[PDB]
Symmetry: C3
Subunit: 132 residues, 3 copies
């Protein structure tokens, strides 16, 4: 009506240990997420990796925490969970799975995942007697 | 059309719920009891059929708590717009203990992911 | 009608054109161009020998096939294909099963979904309610 602009991905640092999310190119699907702490993930184990940022997602999307391709193919790393709700205001955590035979070293400042703004519907739910 | 329609396929089903107006997914409930051993999989029936809104697919996604605490992951998870079968959740247990699912437990979430349905064209080479 | 076209090119004789199982199917089926043996608790990069050009306003998600997951404990790793990716489409397959998994040339290994996304600019604030 009166105002004409573009929605932004907003973030705030929760400590000095966080790194501002970055995008490699203009058409990259996601923003890089960086670990704020050191982690040693043993073989066949999981860790909750803290970024020490909180985000406010633009309306009409959720934030999907998605795997970095290189880490999957080379080190058998996968990302668990990964659904960041539009109204989530806490510390953004990344659930890393280490399926490899060797321990996996995460250092503060390492890129460990990517954040994609996935467009979704928020539909109302209706029970019917039967479907067709 | 525009809403998420569902029907129960037995009295053991639970209507999906959403915690927030801005929550990405509807929670899905197990209709049955399963014991999933370490390093094993199970298909968990919800006993509901769904009709997704036009222009999306239904992604069965992990609940965050179950992933972080219990090493539970969700396999498969692509529900097509035209799928009218019983909604089954493929759960992977990568934990070292057996994981218990009982009737009425929340085991996954359902997200309405907006997608394109593009036509496909073959070209000699791409730049 | 917008440029709602998925374009592809074959990089070798071994590639199969992606197919859709139904009109309202979420993804196009991706086929292996080669033979692979994936040992238990191991991964493999499975090449399709195709390059793709996604429509504007989406990325390509390489997503798992339901049957392979439920029956054989197969999963898909990585799987984010950027709009501007013009390389060979590789599928990272995880075999979490206790037996070896055989991928043959021409087997359906994954599906490609055009997930609609937004490309917001990033803004740092001191507090989330800053004006």
């Amino acid at each position: 009506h009166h105002h004409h602009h573009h929605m932004q991905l907003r973030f705030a640092r929760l400590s000095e240990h966080a790194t501002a999310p970055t995008r490699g190119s203009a058409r990259a699907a996601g923003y890089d997420l960086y670990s704020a702490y050191d982690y040693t993930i043993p073989p066949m184990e999981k860790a909750v990796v803290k970024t020490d940022i909180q985000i406010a997602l633009p309306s009409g999307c959720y934030g999907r925490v998605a795997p970095r391709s290189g880490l999957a193919a080379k080190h058998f790393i996968d990302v668990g969970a990964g659904v960041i709700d539009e109204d989530y205001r806490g510390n953004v955590g990344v659930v890393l799975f280490n399926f490899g035979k060797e321990k996996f070293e995460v250092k503060k400042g390492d890129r460990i995942a990517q954040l994609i703004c996935e467009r979704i519907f928020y539909p109302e739910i209706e029970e019917v007697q039967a479907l067709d």
